[PDB]
Amino acid sequence: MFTVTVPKDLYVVEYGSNMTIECKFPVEKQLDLAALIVYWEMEDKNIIQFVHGEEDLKVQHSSYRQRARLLKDQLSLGNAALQITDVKLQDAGVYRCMISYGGADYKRITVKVNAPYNKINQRILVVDPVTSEHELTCQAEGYPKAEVIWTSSDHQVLSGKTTTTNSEEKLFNVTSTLRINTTTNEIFYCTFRRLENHTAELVIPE
């Protein structure tokens, strides 16, 4: 019998990275491309229409002409791999692969797009060197909204101001400002807690 397998049914890819999702099917010896058909679909869009040797670029949807392709070299291994480049949030969802090869079967695959706050840009502004008054800043992009937790070197917790906007856009820009009098050699921490957490360390200079 002919069974399409998705040994990996859940993909968690990071925003902006490349994605390659796979469907396995039985190939007992030399693959015959003339008897092979491969469909890749998402929602109501056709991504790959690989029929009898060649991709039909006419049926395939316009949003994927340049982003998506089927790794042909893999097919001889009984592996139908769809590659999509620079993944966005609207690439998350359900994909269907249909393999026909002397028998037909299809499977579904879930793709999750993760946009974490793990690139934290920090700023240390000296407002008043007399009183050692500083204005610390932590900023990051990610989805969804997140809150920022400021902690001292004794992991005390302090209050700061936080602003959240939108931008790549439909992503969230989160920036927090902490005004505080310090002690050089002191270490502060900004922690981005998303709705786990990533923390940037801010060392006050001499």
Residue numbers in the entry: 18 to 184, 187 to 214, 218 to 228
Authors' text:
Blockade of PD-1/PD-L1 signaling pathway by monoclonal antibodies (MAbs) to release the anti-tumor activity of pre-existing tumor specific T cell immunity has initiated a new era for tumor immunotherapy. In summary, we report the structural basis of durvalumab-based binding to PD-L1 and the molecular mechanisms of PD-1/PD-L1 blockade.
The complex structure of durvalumab-scFv/PD-L1 was determined by molecular replacement at a resolution of 2.3 Å. The binding of durvalumab to PD-L1 involves both of its heavy chain (VH) and light chain (VL). All of the three complementarity-determining regions (CDRs) of VH and CDR1 and CDR3 of VL contribute to interactions with PD-L1, leaving LCDR2 without any contacts. Here, the binding of durvalumab on PD-L1 was also mainly located on the front β-sheet face which is constituted by A, G, F, C, and C’ strands of the IgV domain of PD-L1. The A, G, and F strands of PD-L1 provide major hydrogen bond interactions with durvalumab. D26 of the A strand and R113 of the F strand of PD-L1 were occupied by S30 of LCDR1 and E58 of HCDR2, respectively. The binding surface of durvalumab and PD-1 on PD-L1 is highly overlapped that residues of PD-L1, which contributed major hydrogen bond interactions with PD-1 (D26, Y123, K124, and R125), were also occupied by durvalumab. Thus, the molecular basis of durvalumab-based PD-1/PD-L1 blockade is that the unbiased binding of durvalumab VH and VL to PD-L1 provides steric clash to abrogate the binding of PD-1/PD-L1. The blockade of avelumab and BMS-936559 to the interaction of PD-1/PD-L1 is mainly contributed by their VH domain while both VH and VL of durvalumab are involved in blockade of PD-1/PD-L1 interaction. On the other hand, the binding of VL does not overlap with that of the nanobody and small-molecule inhibitors. These results indicate that the binding sites of the VH domain of durvalumab may serve as hot spots for small inhibitory biologics development.
